[PDB]
Amino acid sequence: ALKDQLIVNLLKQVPQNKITVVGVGAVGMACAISILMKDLADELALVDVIEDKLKGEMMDLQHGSLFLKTPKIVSSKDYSVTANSKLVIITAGARQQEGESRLNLVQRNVNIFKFIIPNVVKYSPQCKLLIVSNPVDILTYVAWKISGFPKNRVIGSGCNLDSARFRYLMGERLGVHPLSCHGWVLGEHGDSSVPVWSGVNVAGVSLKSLNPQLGTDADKEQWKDVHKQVVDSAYEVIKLKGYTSWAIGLSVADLAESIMKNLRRVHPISTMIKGLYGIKEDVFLSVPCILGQNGISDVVKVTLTPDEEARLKKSADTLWGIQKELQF
Amino acid sequence: ALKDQLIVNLLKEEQVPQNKITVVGVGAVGMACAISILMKDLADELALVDVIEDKLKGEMMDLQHGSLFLKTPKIVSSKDYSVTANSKLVIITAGARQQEGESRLNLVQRNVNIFKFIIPNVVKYSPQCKLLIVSNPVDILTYVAWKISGFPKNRVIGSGCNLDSARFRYLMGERLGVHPLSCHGWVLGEHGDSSVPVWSGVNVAGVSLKSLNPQLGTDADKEQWKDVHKQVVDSAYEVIKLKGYTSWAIGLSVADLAESIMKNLRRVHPISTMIKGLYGIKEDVFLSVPCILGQNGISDVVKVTLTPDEEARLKKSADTLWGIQKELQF
Amino acid sequence: ALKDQLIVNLLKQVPQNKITVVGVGAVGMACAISILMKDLADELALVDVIEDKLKGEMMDLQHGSLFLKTPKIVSSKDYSVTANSKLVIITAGARQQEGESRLNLVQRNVNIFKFIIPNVVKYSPQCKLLIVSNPVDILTYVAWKISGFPKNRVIGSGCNLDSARFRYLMGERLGVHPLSCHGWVLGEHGDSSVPVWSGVNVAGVSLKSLNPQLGTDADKEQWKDVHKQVVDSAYEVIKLKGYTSWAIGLSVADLAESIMKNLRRVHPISTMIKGLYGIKEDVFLSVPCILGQNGISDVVKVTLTPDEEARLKKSADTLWGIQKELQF
Amino acid sequence: ALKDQLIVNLLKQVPQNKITVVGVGAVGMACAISILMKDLADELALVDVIEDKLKGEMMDLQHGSLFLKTPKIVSSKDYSVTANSKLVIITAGARQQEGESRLNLVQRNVNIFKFIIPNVVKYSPQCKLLIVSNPVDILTYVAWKISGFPKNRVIGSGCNLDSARFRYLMGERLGVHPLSCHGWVLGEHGDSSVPVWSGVNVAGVSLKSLNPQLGTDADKEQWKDVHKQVVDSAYEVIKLKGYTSWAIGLSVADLAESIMKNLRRVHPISTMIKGLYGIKEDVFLSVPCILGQNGISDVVKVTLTPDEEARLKKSADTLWGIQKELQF
């Protein structure tokens, strides 16, 4: 053979930094291209239930291999293809229509997770689970209960995107890059999210100390419209292009980088909140977490104003109202 | 104002970007080009143009929302070409795309008509830009953009066979158990059915695969390496059949070309350019040959030493393209 | 000729993203490798007065070109080599010995700047001047006076590194990546620098709000020692390895990135502060600045406590006293 | 404590992609900075015998942590700091001197390896060893013999740099980026290196097909002078700046990238050549190897002309002559 004329084999194949993306819809493929372009993995595996679509997506990424540093890209409906993953990203399930809450996807997606989650853990016992499908906070709780994994290893993309949207809008109003505009959107990745105005700052300068009316209806510059734009973002983009993909793709690759490179950066992501802010139930929602190689190792206790804390508890209550009725 | 309480302004800046890129067409190809360029930190400004207002705004917003994770501080869009002003590079990914089983050549009149509106609008706002054609049939549309723009030929580049060659190197890599970066091989001529695999130049570590197998790429080849070129030709049709279109690979291929232009690299790429004066071609035919690509576009052409059969295939590719090119109404 | 047999020339220029580094000592070379590895420039020029050392450094960088994306690396004792730079980085001059203040370097470095500055500005109409040599704040005032440039174009590396050191040390104490530890060291890049305790935070949570005694002598955890370690850092590193290079090289490449990519990120860098905190003279020192393609376009007005403001005015008085010793 | 007031700890720490650099001279520190800037490791360990120098270098790197994505930088004279390294890079020993062959360092470097190698293997028995110390080809054989490792895990940086230098020089003559100028320099990383003119090409076009006398004495354009410049490069750089560092650091980081990311790229690096080109002894020298996570898995069999083969056998004979009389 030509290969044997050209190459003398001297050694008789396990990946060290494998990532799996489950679900090849627009979200899944945006996560895949973003991870591929951040050189986070030595192996990328894709999984879906639509055979042709799955093979087409895999081939299209494979054909870009010359321009990447991920030497193996594979796919299958069979979960054996996901074996030995360090990180498994779940982007499978129904997505919200225009005028539909992420909360309305819960029954369809819990039922899908009942199949996906045990199959993922069967082949990747050392992985961290990164939940992206909606409603993310409830689905992170669901994946945790199903997986048998400790809670540090089951992470929801949560408010990492809401916070990036908030920082972009703030940056645009101020003429400062989003990197230098600090601001946290916490709670549900959805309608009941909480903008933490008390912590909004540039170079440690509290914007609320300069303008006490910040984020209230009495604010002359209406900064509450910034949070409203954050809440409405997915709806607005869905109305315009039919779905969202790029921003969530980059937000998930951001979380994947902190995990794969054990950075211990702080992210507002879905985790168990029981024990904080008087929350007594197994509610999962976004709070700033330290994220690394073992997932969520620590939770930051944000000092919230009385109104911010009440809003966060109201967000926990909304999530509990849906979660408490789940059968799985 | 809160901005004023927080910040003292020192001066009113010119605000003209220094590394601006425009992507015309926000379909799946255009958006894959946009994301790949954003993730490669090639531009200080990204502008998007299309004729579908809602889809254009939705795409711009979705990229903008990921700004925190990027290093491109301004992302804008409009149906109006004033949004594209002062672009260093303008990437054209607008027009009809191949349906399942459709030749890229079938898109020619629909895309020439669209180019009649697009090209003058681009040139009006960025008279010094490099034009990078991605729309199909790429080779003929690079000729069309060249003629319409009035630009010198160095500033009108077609993505050509950069992707075909990347597909060839991936497939070769898979057969040899080597990364595609260490597998060398060139696919020339039309970015389509008449492309030419240059078997005589296919190598790993400078070892000619044809020197080990003299029947390489022929019908008499026991390993049927010609099937690698057939897979290259069929790739887009196969991906279209499975997912409905192609995007990732062309997006990565366009960003690779954008990188050589924006960073004045002077790397060699098989891209669409005028081949008149080479291989006995007497006409203004545009097709892929290896070109040195930099800040001024195509500054030089590599003269590939083709075998008589390879040269015959390249002239056949030239004949097919010229047949359509010579009769264009614009 | 073989080149003409292989290549048909089709076209008959000017660099678009050129950077010059003046000084090929350990600092200058650390800036050069950091800039090369960050893909910030299409051309890199080096300038020094020692012919052999300069040529040797240029050649060693050129030999790594295959692994880089900067296609032209050049050098000369003649400033015509720096023509058409967008950014000129000054790392020339005497360095402090153990037990020697950076302020003691003033007369030697001013004399050198009287030659370098007019020669640099002559060939690059669009350049920003980035001063690294010490005392950086004083030398930024000096480069500003000699060049006749507007203040937005004359920047001192200032406290960008002091703040990076502060954030690293804070990160170590908290088990958090420095990227998620926020805190500002302002004023002189030296002994009189000011840690802005009021702005020190993780996820928008003020550390001073949790420990009102933070940074004071009454602090049980002695966070003031973190600022003392920042002040002493260069001297500790000098005593150990003889000089410092890597951290400053990275700090300067971070500033070069904001400039070259027009990021508009906020950095604590040397600029004129006349008109803020009761300062009435042309004092240069570090304050949070928005940095982009036109240099410093905007200054953030940090809200300081009376004690922090008094420490910042003390630093300004120190620097102004040295400025009064300058002979142009 | 402030940390406990701020953060709720949920989880009480082994690196997954650790690299150790042994030797903190100019070569070692250039490897370290290049590896840090390429985001190849989650932990970097430094080892040397000069305690102050070692601590100063580690601190200087640590201070730039905010600008990097390698969260743990550690050092010690004690090899326990190197535990669980995936890759251990040896840069220690006597360095090439002005007007002196790299072969002049052999005995002293063999003696040093008798200490280093058992210490490295004790703490990371499954690492890949990357030898950079000179004479690299003989020291790779030495490291292989002392370590007891299988030959795939003992790699010499070999001719990866000589080939990068060759491609830079070819690129300058042709007006093409070195990435698009292909050519291999094999054999000894030193005076007896072999330029493979038969494989030298641009876009698959053999330069020898355009100039049959390419690289010979009869070559009208005297391309042999390019290989002479490759051979002389370290002697010239040493004469000018005292040592070489930047290019070798980038060449080593290029090899570290292929190992750490399992790229299976082809590199001209030091491996056992017994059984090829009539070589019957345990000689190590550069031939094009496939490099990945298990080190050298395969060797490309280059079709050398009779001239090129005789030149490679001579390089093998020069190395065996020295190696034969070692004792260890």
Ligand SMILES: CCNC(=O)NCCC(=O)Nc1ccc2nc(C)sc2c1
């Ligand atoms: C995150 C937004 N949602 C999407 O992008 N959804 C489209 C992709 C998708 O749902 N794939 C998929 C994959 C696996 C799978 N296993 C089952 C038992 S059903 C199923 C469905």
Ligand SMILES: CCNC(=O)NCCC(=O)Nc1ccc2nc(C)sc2c1
């Ligand atoms: C390359 C594959 N083609 C696609 O991705 N096509 C979809 C996007 C597209 O065609 N946009 C667009 C943009 C401008 C424009 N100007 C006109 C007069 S028509 C027109 C259409």
Ligand SMILES: CCNC(=O)NCCC(=O)Nc1ccc2nc(C)sc2c1
């Ligand atoms: C910041 C730490 N300082 C250093 O790294 N200094 C060493 C490098 C150095 O001083 N170069 C240099 C360059 C130009 C020049 N022009 C003159 C009239 S004197 C002179 C000296």
Ligand SMILES: CCNC(=O)NCCC(=O)Nc1ccc2nc(C)sc2c1
């Ligand atoms: C490649 C050029 N060589 C250099 O840069 N060398 C300087 C650094 C150096 O030799 N370190 C060092 C480290 C460990 C060690 N263990 C021993 C028993 S001796 C010894 C010496």
